[PDB]
């Protein structure tokens, strides 16, 4: 049994509407984790129960080096807490904003890890649906860790479809902006957007007004920098194909199509998951409490069932 009192609460790492993430130390072990704390009252009143139970189930039933693992999930009378592996290197969003653009080789390393994580997810019948720079963290070694599983859909195999209008606006696949249902190829669209941001230094489609933004996504052709390699242009054009049936990854073989693309020719896929590749950037933290890869905006801030049947959990690691 796990309680709030089993932890020291050190720094705010992130803060959504529906909760906050705090850097915590487990007192008995001296180990550090990221705790997501949600308020039950808010979760219930705002109809976020299904998403929260889904994130719990997904985290309970996945194990992969490029997904953040769940150590403990527990509840109190007014809170739900997820204790997860702490990604010390912060969000890819942090890094890309600092550096403006990544080399193709650096984007390839991250892209390959994301492809492996997506492959694994789809193999567990999970569609992730929210690939974006904020949800892609770096661990202490510089490997990708996908976080935030609340928008996942489970039990999606092969060509099964989904109906919920969800994700993040700037990253929505064109089929999601049409009526009716969509399949798992939405995840390859999201990879293409993040890859495009990594190698081109901006979103492929952007407007502050969601009506204009969604028009661009549906109707505008993407542009490439003249000096992007032909293989990177081809990868991006393939993942950002508007028709999911023509999209790279959109066919029956799903991730395999992406892994086979010439952009990834140099990648040994069997080695990606075994983490034999030296990452192109190791976070230079000087302590487990060093939050230099997280925004001051958050880290400066001080920190003063039936329905939830499938929630609680203790890992076998």
């Amino acid at each position: 049994k796990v309680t709030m009192n089993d932890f020291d609460y050190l720094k705010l790492l992130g803060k959504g509407t529906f909760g906050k993430v705090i850097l915590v130390r487990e007192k008995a072990t001296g180990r550090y984790y990221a705790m997501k704390i949600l308020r039950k009252e808010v979760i219930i009143a705002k109809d976020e129960v299904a998403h929260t139970v889904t994130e719990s189930r997904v985290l309970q039933n996945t194990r992969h080096p490029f997904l953040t693992a769940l150590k403990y999930a527990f509840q109190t009378h007014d809170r739900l807490c997820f204790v997860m592996e702490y990604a010390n290197g912060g969000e890819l969003f942090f890094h890309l904003s600092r550096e403006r653009v990544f080399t193709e080789e650096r984007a390839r390393f991250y892209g390959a890890e994301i492809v492996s994580a997506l492959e694994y997810l789809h193999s567990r019948d999970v569609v992730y649906r929210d690939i974006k720079l904020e949800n892609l963290m770096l661990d202490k070694d510089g490997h990708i860790k996908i976080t935030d599983f609340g928008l996942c859909k489970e039990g999606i195999s092969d060509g099964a479809t989904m109906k919920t209008f969800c994700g993040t606006p700037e990253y929505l696949a064109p089929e999601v902006l049409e009526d009716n249902d969509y399949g798992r190829a939405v995840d390859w669209w999201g990879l293409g957007v993040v890859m495009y941001e990594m190698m081109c230094g901006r979103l492929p489609f952007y407007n502050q007004d969601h009506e204009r933004l969604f028009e661009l996504i549906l109707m505008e052709e993407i542009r490439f920098p003249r000096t992007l390699s032909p293989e990177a242009k081809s990868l991006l054009a393939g993942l950002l194909k508007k028709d999911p049936k023509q999209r790279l990854g959109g066919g029956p073989s799903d991730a395999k199509e992406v892994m086979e693309h010439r952009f990834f020719l140099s990648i040994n896929w069997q080695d990606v998951v075994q983490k034999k590749l030296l990452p192109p950037f190791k976070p230079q933290v000087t302590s487990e409490v060093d939050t230099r890869y997280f925004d001051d905006e958050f880290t400066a801030q001080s920190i003063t069932q039936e329905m939830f049947e499938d929630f609680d959990y203790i890992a076998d690691w």
């Binding site: 904003s97 403006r100 904020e134 993040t168 901006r202």
Partner: peptide, 10 residues
């Protein structure tokens, strides 16, 4: 250097 984005569901 885009603004931070927000996930949603309807």
């Amino acid at each position: 250097g885009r603004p931070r984005t927000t996930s949603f569901a309807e």
